[PDB]
């Protein structure tokens, strides 16, 4: 089952881009400190998550 892997990994590449715009890391974004979330999201992200939805 080669190809559906690849369709959904292009989608997962988009979500890695969203994590990068939030923190900066590709995958291992630390980003959740104890006591609430640190360094909140920059202006212009929710519309992108809506389009992805």
């Amino acid at each position: 089952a080669m190809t559906p892997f690849f369709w959904m990994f292009e989608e997962r590449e988009k979500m890695f881009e969203f994590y990068e715009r939030v923190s900066g890391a590709r995958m291992h974004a630390a980003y959740v400190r104890p006591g609430g979330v640190h360094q909140d999201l920059p202006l212009g992200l929710m519309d992108d998550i809506y389009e992805f939805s």
């Binding site: 909140d40 920059p42 202006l43 212009g44 929710m46 809506y50």
Partner: protein, 68 residues
């Protein structure tokens, strides 16, 4: 002033529901399609085989009359 990222007046609706076209063709009629193509091929096959038997008997007559 305050400049966070809110939803701008509430966003539009989001789809989530499944969808399948269920096409279709009412498969008993598709069996009729297959059997029709099958019998079509058999009709034309029968016609060509009998005309080729005619020509093969003509080649038989050729070898018979040429033989002595």
């Amino acid at each position: 002033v305050k400049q966070d990222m809110p939803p701008v007046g509430g966003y539009g609706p989001i789809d989530y529901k499944r969808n399948l076209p269920r096409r279709g063709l009412s498969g008993y009629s598709m069996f009729a399609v297959g059997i029709g193509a099958l019998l079509f091929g058999y009709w034309s096959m029968m016609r060509w085989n009998r005309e080729r038997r005619r020509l093969q008997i003509e080649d038989f007559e050729a070898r018979i009359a040429l033989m002595p």
